[PDB]
Amino acid sequence: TQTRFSQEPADQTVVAGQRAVLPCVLLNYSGIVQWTKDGLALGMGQGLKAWPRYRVVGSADAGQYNLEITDAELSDDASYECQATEAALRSRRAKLTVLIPPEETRIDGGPVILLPYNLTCRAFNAKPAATIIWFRDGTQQEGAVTSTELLKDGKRETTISQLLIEPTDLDIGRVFTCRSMNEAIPNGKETSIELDV
Amino acid sequence: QTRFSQEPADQTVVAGQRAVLPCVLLNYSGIVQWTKDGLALGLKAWPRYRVVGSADAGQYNLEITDAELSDDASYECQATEAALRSRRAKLTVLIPPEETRIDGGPVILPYNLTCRAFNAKPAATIIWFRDGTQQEGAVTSTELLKDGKRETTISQLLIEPTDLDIGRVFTCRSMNEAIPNGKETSIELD
Ligand SMILES: *[C@@H]1O[C@H](CO)[C@@H](O[C@@H]2O[C@H](CO)[C@@H](O[C@@H]3O[C@H](CO)[C@@H](O)[C@H](O)[C@@H]3O)[C@H](O)[C@H]2NC(C)=O)[C@H](O)[C@H]1NC(C)=O
Ligand SMILES: *[C@@H]1O[C@H](CO)[C@@H](O[C@@H]2O[C@H](CO)[C@@H](O)[C@H](O)[C@H]2NC(C)=O)[C@H](O)[C@H]1NC(C)=O
């Protein structure tokens, strides 16, 4: 009747600036428990030095060694496992998906775009690829061309939706708003721009 | 600040042999650990595992005695306490063939032969010869095994027995990188 894992860590989805805990409890264990981050060790005891926002918590008595990450970051998006030494085995794979909202998304037309012309809304630095929705006052799906652009680090993307407008004496004074949301964002941010001929 | 003067390298070790992985880090005050396929490592509760070298000069080399197929893994001497990982160490643990024999029995009275090397890494090569190398006819065909690490090479020989070859011995040798000189099984034609 050796050591076992009552609960092993599972794949969790966390948004940026949030707290996460990975369920790792192993009964019949008095031995040291470690954590693996892409093949990297964390720390001995329940005090993880030289690491920011990393602290293992839970019941030391019940064999519970849950890792706690506060204020999640793009860096934390990785694979984890709470393996233990002293004749103990590893513990599953933990894919941490740290979702991040788009930043300062706007339409490449300025405050007002005076002029078969075009508009385009661009979402920047979001993972997963944020979705752009085009509408003046009611959804104008017609024309919207969603195109995803991968970023430097290859983890996040920059979706750009090119709109096929054809301005007239009507659309003048009429605002064209563009919202952009992702799994990190329930209700996307919007930029209000003014058309002109 | 702290660095790795020498990092572990991909090493080839034969079965039942001793290996050391070079890991020396200057200007270090942190504890140094080792990684085996994303697993942490005087290594208790484990046999033949002992890290050695000079703690004073910063040398932390890993020592493995009596190598085995299980030890075939990826390693790195990463350190805790604000320290980084250290390269990748692909340890190739070579193993000799086991019980290689000819599927003809002690004596095999348009016939065929085949010598079969079993459970060797890398795939052992079979060489056919009565008294001098008779590569002609030998058909080497490698067969991978369940765990996909080792193989079972089988060389089928295209013989055609006659009144001459009787009493004449047919030996079959099988060698690999783990075996400089392969073992041979002697069979009698009839
Ligand atoms: C004696 O050993 C020789 C050498 O292996 C055997 O000759 C082999 O005969 C088989 C047919 O029975 C050939 O297999 C064929 O391969 C093709 C693929 O290229 C496949 O599509 C066919 O359906 C067929 O299976 C094989 O090529 C041939 N070997 C050589 C080197 O020519 C012979 O069968 C053995 N005899 C005995 C009694 O064991
Ligand atoms: C307005 O936006 C549309 C949408 O992309 C652009 O149309 C593209 O035109 C090029 C030809 O130069 C094609 O290769 C692309 O396939 C077209 N896109 C689509 C979705 O069909 C058009 O170029 C833009 N006009 C501008 C920016 O002045």
UniProtKB/Swiss-Prot annotation, chain A:
Q: Where in the cell is it found?
A: Cell membrane
Its PTM note reads: Phosphorylation probably regulates the interaction with NPHS2.
Intrachain S-S bonds: 24-82, 121-178
Q: Which residues are glycosylated?
A: 28, 118
Ig-like C2-type domain ranges (all copies): 1-97, 102-194
What tissues contain this protein? Abundantly expressed in kidney. Specifically expressed in podocytes of kidney glomeruli.
Additional facts recorded: Knockout of this gene results in perinatal lethality accompanied by proteinuria, and effacement of glomerular podocytes.
Quaternary structure annotation from Swiss-Prot or TrEMBL = Interacts with TJP1/ZO-1 and with NPHS2/podocin (via the C-terminus). Interacts with NPHS1/nephrin (via the Ig-like domains); this interaction is dependent on KIRREL1 glycosylation. Homodimer (via the Ig-like domains). Interacts when tyrosine-phosphorylated with GRB2.
Family per similarity comment: Belongs to the immunoglobulin superfamily.
Q: Tell me, what does this protein do in biology?
A: Required for proper function of the glomerular filtration barrier. It is involved in the maintenance of a stable podocyte architecture with interdigitating foot processes connected by specialized cell-cell junctions, known as the slit diaphragm. Is a signaling protein that needs the presence of TEC kinases to fully trans-activate the transcription factor AP-1.
Quote the protein name from its UniProt record. Kin of IRRE-like protein 1
Q: What gene is behind this protein?
A: Kirrel1
From Swiss-Prot, chain B:
Disulfide-bonded cysteines? 23-77, 115-172
Alphabetized, the UniProt keywords read: Cell membrane, Disulfide bond, Glycoprotein, Immunoglobulin domain, Membrane, Phosphoprotein, Repeat, Signal, Transmembrane, Transmembrane helix
State the Gene Ontology terms under molecular function: myosin binding
The full protein's residues present here are 52 to 250 of 789
Q: What else is known?
A: Knockout of this gene results in perinatal lethality accompanied by proteinuria, and effacement of glomerular podocytes.
Glycosylated sites: 27, 112
Which protein, by its recorded name, is this?
A: Kin of IRRE-like protein 1
Q: What's the family?
A: Belongs to the immunoglobulin superfamily.
Report domain Ig-like C2-type positions. Answer: 1-92, 97-188
